[PDB]
């Protein structure tokens with residue numbers, strides 16, 4: 001179990017750790033988060049009391065180094081940094097843990113929510129979507145736009161998700177126009193799975209990362225990416241059986257975990273009704289359909 | 301953006317454009333089977349592709365053999381239409397290719413957009429106008445060439461005959477839409493109006509009778525009367 005210690009909390013902030021969150025008052029004696037489960041990525045995220053504008057946060061994996069948070073009063077945010085002296089960090093964390101100035105990652109033992117939302121998410125893939133190679137952790141916020149978005153402005157601060165566009169040459173084989181537009185299996189299986197993502201795990205990883213950026217930061221292009229990757233699978237007549245089953249589990253937990261009061265903006269009516277009720281895979285998402293009908297029957 | 305009354309004059313500017321109508325592409329007679337079920341038999345159709353500035357009409361005849369053994373024909377018809385339209389663009393010299401293609405039914409937007417991916421500079425537009433191009437099969441010479449075709453065939457017409465020698469393309473298009481709207485609302489009466497006088501003929505290389513300017517005014521009047529009436533006879537007014 002690892003630790004994300006904090007130098008201090010000088011401004012009042014709601015701090016998020018994975019799907020959990022807690023309020024820290026201005027200058028409260030808070031020195032960070034302990035007992036963080038090893039073996040998964042994580043995200044620690046922030047919403048300042050004064051300016052609810054800009055949710056922001058850091059994706060990180062504690063196996064990749066010792067990371068702490070310090071408030072920067074010039075840039076006005078909580079910044080993640082790497083402590084490159086192992087001894088200073090162990091001692092400091094011990095000091096904090098002794099004074100009990102840290103909140104415990106509050107994982108219930110029955111609970112596999114986080115594993116289930118991040119099953120296929122890998123820090124190495126995150127770092128290729130979020131390009132900032134001098135750091136081992138990745139900053140995301142509400143306002144970052146995607147590569148695809150910028151095509152339709154600052155490249156260094158983009159989310160380099162894989163571009164999916166149903167009305168593109170990449171998606172549409174010359175002479176198979178109708179075939180490929182109505183049955184995207186080509187684009188899914190050959191172009192994307194075999195060609196770009198290499199395997200279904202990398203595909204699901206990006207899909208799960210898109211969702212999580214959409215839910216935690218209200219990142220709009222991330223939500224667009226999530227729905228596009230869902231819609232490419234659902235609109236493919238030929239999907240490996242293992243991918244459909246896993247997709248149903250994947251989506252089930254995303255829907256389970258969505259805040260009820262955010263479904264209005266995070267869920268695209270067209271995509272979900274098409275996917276659950278019209279598409280090739282309309283029958284292949286029993287868990288996702290059942291949870292969606294019992295929790296958001298209005299959208300449908 | 302969509303084409304509507306507000307931007308009507310854009311049709312007659314000097315940017316090449318084409319209207320595409322797919323209404324008559326897939327045509328069926330519906331009939332009963334010996335077992336008392338219902339079946340459709342297809343008949344020849346056509347794609348109605350028109351330059352509204354020049355009157356050049358690219359009539360692509362759709363022979364019933366193109367449906368043989370195919371499923372979901374109403375949906376294929378839109379894609380087939382899109383394929384023929386894109387093959388047509390591709391066959392034209394660059395300086396003749398349209399800068400815009402306007403589809404008369406929105407369900408053609410995506411099929412055409414996908415087939416024209418190779419032409420990103422050709423804008424595919426819908427219209428809000430309720431244009432009467434479906435009635436082109438009420439034009440005897442066009443119906444005749446469609447019905448007689450034994451194979452896929454492209455036939456080229458000027459749907460304005462020689463009118464552009466005497467009137468502007470705005471007035472020619474307005475005449476055309478008035479005639480086609482009349483033929484669509486009451487085809488018998490519209491045709492009675494066009495041929496009531498045995499002395500006004502249709503030139504062998506034309507579609508519509510050889511009316512003088514004065515006779516076109518009378519004719520156009522008679523077509524507007526018909527359209528108002530049939531609106532009455534329909535709505536009782």
Ligand SMILES: NC(=O)CNc1ccccc1
Pocket residue numbers: 005006007068083088089092093
């Ligand atoms: N003290 C330092 O200069 C590095 N800051 C620090 C604060 C918390 C935990 C680890 C390091």
